[PDB]
Amino acid sequence: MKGIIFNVLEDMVVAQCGMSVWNELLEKHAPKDRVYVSAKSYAESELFSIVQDVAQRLNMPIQDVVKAFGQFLFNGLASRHTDVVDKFDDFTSLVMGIHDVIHLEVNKLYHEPSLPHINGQLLPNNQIALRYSSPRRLCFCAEGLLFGAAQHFAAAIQISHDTCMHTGADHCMLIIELQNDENLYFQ
Numbered sequence: 041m042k043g044i045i046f047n048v049l050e051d052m053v054v055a056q057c058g059m060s061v062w063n064e065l066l067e068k069h070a071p072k073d074r075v076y077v078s079a080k081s082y083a084e085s086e087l088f089s090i091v092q093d094v095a096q097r098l099n100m101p102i103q104d105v106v107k108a109f110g111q112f113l114f115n116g117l118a119s120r121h122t123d124v125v126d127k128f129d130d131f132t133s134l135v136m137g138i139h140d141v142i143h144l145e146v147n148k149l150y151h152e153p154s155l156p157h158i159n160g161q162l163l164p165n166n167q168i169a170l171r172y173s174s175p176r177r178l179c180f181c182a183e184g185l186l187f188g189a190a191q192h193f194a195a196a197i198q199i200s201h202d203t204c205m206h207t208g209a210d211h212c213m214l215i216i217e218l219q220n221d222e223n224l225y226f227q
């Protein structure tokens with residue numbers, strides 16, 4: 041898990057809970073004097089432990105917290121990698137380019153990142169079938185990231201998530217409906 045994910049998580053926790061809470065989280069779930077260098081890899085368990093702690097503190101379902109983080113995370117990534125996101129002029133283009141363009145770039149930007157396998161298929165009625173697979177099973181982070189991407193393009197979406205690794209499948213199917221964006225008028 042790359043430090044950049046931890047850095048954006050810090051921004052979120054500091055904004056919601058305060059720096060005092062982040063320092064508690066860091067002291068408890070990470071070794072002494074831990075500093076997350078953006079490009080460096082760290083144990084994903086450190087991230088999960090922190091996020092689980094946050095969920096418990098807020099009395100929220102863990103997957104709702106991960107989804108919220110995902111949405112916050114897209115802007116964190118877009119602002120740190122503006123050149124990557126500026127490759128796309130709309131939401132649908134970006135989603136279809138997650139695997140072959142965005143995460144391909146991430147492999148050039150970072151040393152041996154741990155990334156999901158994603159494949160998007162354009163459907164009728166302005167829908168996208170996004171197939172997600174990963175041993176980390178962060179499909180709800182993916183959901184959040186998609187809502188973040190929609191927000192980035194001033195678009196509105198809905199997601200159906202009825203095939204899921206957490207309900208026993210070896211992949212998740214995220215069915216994305218584009219309800220509105222700047223090029224969508226009546227239909």
Ligand code: HEM
Binds near residue numbers: 045142154186
């Ligand atoms: C809707 C858009 C996106 C989706 C659905 C998505 C999906 C994901 C997910 C779910 C993860 C967690 C790892 C896993 O599931 O195995 C991940 C990791 C990551 N993604 Fe994306 N992502 C999106 C956009 C971006 C963008 C715009 C960037 C940067 C330009 C980016 C760079 C990264 C990086 C650096 C990691 C961490 C890799 C590691 O820790 O080794 N992603 N992505």
Ligand code: NA
Binds near residue numbers: 221222
């Ligand atoms: Na519109």
Ligand SMILES: [Zn+2]
Binds near residue numbers: 179180201206
């Ligand atoms: Zn899932």
